[PDB]
Amino acid sequence: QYSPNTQQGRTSIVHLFEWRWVDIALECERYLAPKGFGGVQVSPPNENVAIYNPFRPWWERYQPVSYKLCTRSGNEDEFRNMVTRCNNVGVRIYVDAVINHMCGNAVSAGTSSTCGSYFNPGSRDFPAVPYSGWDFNDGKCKTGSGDIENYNDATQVRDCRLTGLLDLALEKDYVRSKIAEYMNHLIDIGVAGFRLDASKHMWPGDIKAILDKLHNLNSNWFPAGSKPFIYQEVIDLGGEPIKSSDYFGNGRVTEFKYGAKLGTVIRKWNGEKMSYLKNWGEGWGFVPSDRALVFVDNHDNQRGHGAGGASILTFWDARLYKMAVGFMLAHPYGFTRVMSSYRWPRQFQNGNDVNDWVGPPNNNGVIKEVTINPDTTCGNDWVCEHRWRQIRNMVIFRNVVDGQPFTNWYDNGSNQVAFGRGNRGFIVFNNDDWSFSLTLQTGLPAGTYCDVISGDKINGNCTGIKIYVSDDGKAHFSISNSAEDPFIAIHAESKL
Numbered sequence: 001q002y003s004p005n006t007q008q009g010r011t012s013i014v015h016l017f018e019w020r021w022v023d024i025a026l027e028c029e030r031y032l033a034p035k036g037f038g039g040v041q042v043s044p045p046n047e048n049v050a051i052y053n054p055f056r057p058w059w060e061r062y063q064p065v066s067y068k069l070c071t072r073s074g075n076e077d078e079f080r081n082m083v084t085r086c087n088n089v090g091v092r093i094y095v096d097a098v099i100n101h102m103c104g105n106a107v108s109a110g111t112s113s114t115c116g117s118y119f120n121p122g123s124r125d126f127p128a129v130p131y132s133g134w135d136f137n138d139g140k141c142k143t144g145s146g147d148i149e150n151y152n153d154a155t156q157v158r159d160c161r162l163t164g165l166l167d168l169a170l171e172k173d174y175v176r177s178k179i180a181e182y183m184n185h186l187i188d189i190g191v192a193g194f195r196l197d198a199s200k201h202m203w204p205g206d207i208k209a210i211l212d213k214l215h216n217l218n219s220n221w222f223p224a225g226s227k228p229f230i231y232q233e234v235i236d237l238g239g240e241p242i243k244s245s246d247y248f249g250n251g252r253v254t255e256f257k258y259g260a261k262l263g264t265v266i267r268k269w270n271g272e273k274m275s276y277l278k279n280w281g282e283g284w285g286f287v288p289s290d291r292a293l294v295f296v297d298n299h300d301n302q303r304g305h306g307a308g309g310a311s312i313l314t315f316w317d318a319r320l321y322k323m324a325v326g327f328m329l330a331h332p333y334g335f336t337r338v339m340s341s342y343r344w345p346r347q348f349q350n351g352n353d354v355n356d357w358v359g360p361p362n363n364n365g366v367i368k369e370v371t372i373n374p375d376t377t378c379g380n381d382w383v384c385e386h387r388w389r390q391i392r393n394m395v396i397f398r399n400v401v402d403g404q405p406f407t408n409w410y411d412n413g414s415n416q417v418a419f420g421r422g423n424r425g426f427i428v429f430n431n432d433d434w435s436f437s438l439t440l441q442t443g444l445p446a447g448t449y450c451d452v453i454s455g456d457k458i459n460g461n462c463t464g465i466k467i468y469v470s471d472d473g474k475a476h477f478s479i480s481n482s483a484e485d486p487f488i489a490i491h492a493e494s495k496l
Ligand SMILES: OC[C@H]1N/C(=N\O)[C@H](O)[C@@H](O)[C@@H]1O[C@H]1O[C@H](CO)[C@@H](O[C@H]2O[C@H](CO)[C@@H](O)[C@H](O)[C@H]2O)[C@H](O)[C@H]1O
Pocket: 059, 060, 061, 062, 063, 098, 103, 104, 105, 106, 107, 162, 163, 164, 165, 197, 198, 199, 233, 300, 305
């Protein structure tokens, strides 16, 4: 559960949020594999509630009805087709496993689901699994509302309903087996791992009992004895009885303090500066590198639904976001996850977004296809951050510098920083309100290098800035605070 199971030399995964299976399959072949992306985190593939008030929100997918592979993203045949085509081209598939709960208790009984399966939240009947009232935590929860009321009581956070979501009794072997049957069906299809949703709301021992029932990965693509990659979503910002370290024996954990602090540093909040990033990682109270799944923003906090607050950098903050994603992809700490989103009509009323519910670009409920524009960007309101030159080239930078140590740090005591990754890469940042013009030590061999941020290396030449490294590793870098991208990155493969 700790090893990504990605192809050797591919170091990042991308969250293709709300994308259809046929579009991910095409993306695996046309972009992800040629550009060196390791994998894809997909939205929940299991049947969910079709919520019409409000109109088909993104969050309806976090309300399971059954374990049938039938969603707005596609059916079972389309899912298998995607997994097979992606694996054959070396791009892994990771499933967002929503296993803590079923739907909200206030949801109406009927067939208002993505595959037409009947369900009754009131009587706790989900015949398509099958689950009954005996499979839920209604008698185990000791709160007066039945929902989670206080986060200082570790027991209720696990045994009660997260905002009304019917809590599955995970101590029961029947419930563990039904979840394992679902996860094993997916492993055998070819998925490389899972995102365990709402892990904070499940007991570490209960998760371990479910993982013990899991198969090794499909031996047609993976070597014998390969265990599925497990990354648990535990939102731990400190100061709670539940720690993300309680989950280390099961797999990796999502490090939310990472995106929160990188956001405050780059926005320069509370006097924080980039020079403090010298000891970035464990020195800041984060989980150990080999247990961390890192990201700048996720599907939740990019629209204010998880934790991190107003500090979180998203595609809306384009210029600062590319620097954050650039820093993340260059720094050795943890396993990296790149976000790929869609544009929604943000509307701030009293400091908060009233349109945070808005689902994926659609036509009367049917999710729109990802159309490709002539400049490699996406149409139909898909932002496609993974396709932006600055982000795409930084994904390749991480691949080229894999295994190299953190060396040659420089800082001006403010926000102009720089570091190298052994003898394979170097990156410089300028987040100050003045220009940077200095000669720094790189650790890289002599030659002419293309800046992968301002341009590309197309047939023996650079389309952007050129950096000249001398015999002793020194190189002059000139970055203006007025530049579209106030950072320069050069690596072993961008060399002329
Ligand atoms: O997996 C359950 C949550 N835990 C998660 N990680 O721990 C997901 O990342 C997050 O997206 C999920 O909440 C999302 O999915 C929930 C179910 O759809 C939404 O709740 C919604 O449904 C509830 C029950 O019907 C309502 O009470 C609530 O007001 C309504 O917003 C919630 O706001 C939305 O952030």
